[PDB]
DNA sequence: ACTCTGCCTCAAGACGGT
DNA sequence: TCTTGAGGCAGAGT
DNA sequence: ACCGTCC
């Protein structure tokens, strides 16, 4: 994402989070980062050190949570589309490289503590190497629509796409832990929405308008901004942070005018620099086109459903039963049925 | 006194009885 | 074949 | 709400 976007934004820019009870969002429609959620459940869906499966040796963890936590946002009245992750934009590869070296100093390190014998520590780089595949993406694809529950393939970035579809007016806001979706141009950013029997964090709503009114800036200026904070992207300038580029920007408006406005003595501009192009790629991102599909969710698949995840995924038929009842009574409660005219 | 580097470390769920 | 976030601290730079 | 368990 942004580095340290939502600290900047709690110290300079209070008045753009705001918080609300769950009870409150009974009828709303959000988009969710699909892969971060799945990434979620992989990594803390476990049971002394090994991921939930089947006797075929194949990973459930994320059908699991897909499943209960879905119901359980249906059941507090929120209609969710998930959003899946495309091509990413080349400007990331770099970044893409970097997090590949975080697994290269983690699988080889899998290696003399695994034989050591330390359990806790094996199981935190195990859980420091998990990748969300395909298989992953496609059989959580597979078990929302056999839910009712709608999806959507974006071109590139999911973020980018979810701040459309809040743009357009399609949902509400983007559910996502992402802080770049502000960049894309979200107006609305949801954090800490899973709705659970044990609730920890609350949800809080970060809006654009009020962030770029706090800071006196509009959204090129803020794309500056966060380009200059940390994107993921392109580098940033080596000494300035949060503090030095709030005051840049707010002085000079532009990363053009700031290069064209400092000492390079002091502070060195980052060899072959491509600002310009994620300046653009930020403005105007690849995405899909919200008006195509209208999103509806629909009367779950009880048999499918008890097939697919009882017969092959090996889960409790009753819990499944009773899981689905809940969820085609939840959507019983908040959507309307076609109307014919 | 601020502020940023540049490292280091860490983290990511939910159910059905009690 | 593709997700991210948050601190703490020594030390130099402002 | 705690805690063994989910697959
Ligand atoms: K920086
Ligand atoms: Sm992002
Ligand atoms: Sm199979
Ligand atoms: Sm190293
Ligand atoms: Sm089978
Ligand atoms: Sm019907």
């Not at 654009?208 to 992207?233: A, H, K, P, T």
Request: glycine share 6%; with cysteine.
């Amino acid at each position: 994402g942004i580095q340290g976007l939502a600290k900047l934004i709690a110290d300079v820019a209070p008045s753009a989070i705001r918080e609300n009870d769950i009870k409150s969002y009974f009828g709303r429609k959000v988009a969710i980062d699909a892969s971060m959620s799945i990434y979620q459940f992989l990594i803390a869906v476990r049971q002394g050190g090994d991921v939930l499966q089947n006797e075929e040796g194949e990973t459930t963890s994320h059908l699991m949570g897909m499943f209960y936590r879905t119901i359980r946002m249906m059941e507090n009245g929120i209609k969710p589309v998930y959003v899946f992750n495309g091509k990413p934009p080349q400007l990331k590869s770099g970044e893409l490289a970097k997090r590949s070296e975080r697994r290269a100093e983690a699988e080889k390190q899998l290696q003399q503590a695994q034989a050591a014998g330390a359990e806790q520590e094996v199981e935190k780089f195990t859980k420091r190497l998990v990748k969300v595949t395909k298989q992953h993406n496609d059989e959580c694809k597979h078990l929302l629509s056999l839910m009712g529950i709608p999806y959507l393939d974006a071109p590139s970035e999911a973020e980018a796409s979810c701040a459309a579809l809040v743009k357009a007016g399609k949902v509400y806001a983007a559910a996502t832990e992402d802080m770049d979706c502000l960049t894309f141009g979200s107006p609305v950013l949801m954090r800490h929405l899973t709705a659970s029997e044990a609730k920890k964090l609350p949800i809080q709503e970060f809006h654009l308008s009020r962030i770029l009114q706090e800071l006196g800036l509009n959204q090129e200026q803020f794309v500056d901004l966060c380009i200059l904070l940390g994107s993921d992207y392109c580098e940033s300038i080596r000494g300035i942070g949060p503090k030095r580029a709030v005051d840049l920007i707010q002085k000079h408006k532009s990363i053009e005018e700031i290069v064209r406005r400092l000492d390079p003595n002091k502070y060195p501009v980052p060899e072959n620099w491509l600002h310009k192009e994620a300046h653009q790629l930020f403005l105007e991102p690849e995405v899909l086109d919200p008006e195509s599909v209208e999103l509806k969710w629909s009367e779950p698949n009880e048999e499918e459903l008890i097939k697919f995840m009882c017969g092959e995924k090996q889960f409790s038929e009753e819990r499944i039963r009773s899981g689905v009842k809940r969820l085609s009574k939840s959507r019983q409660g908040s959507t309307l049925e076609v109307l014919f005219q």
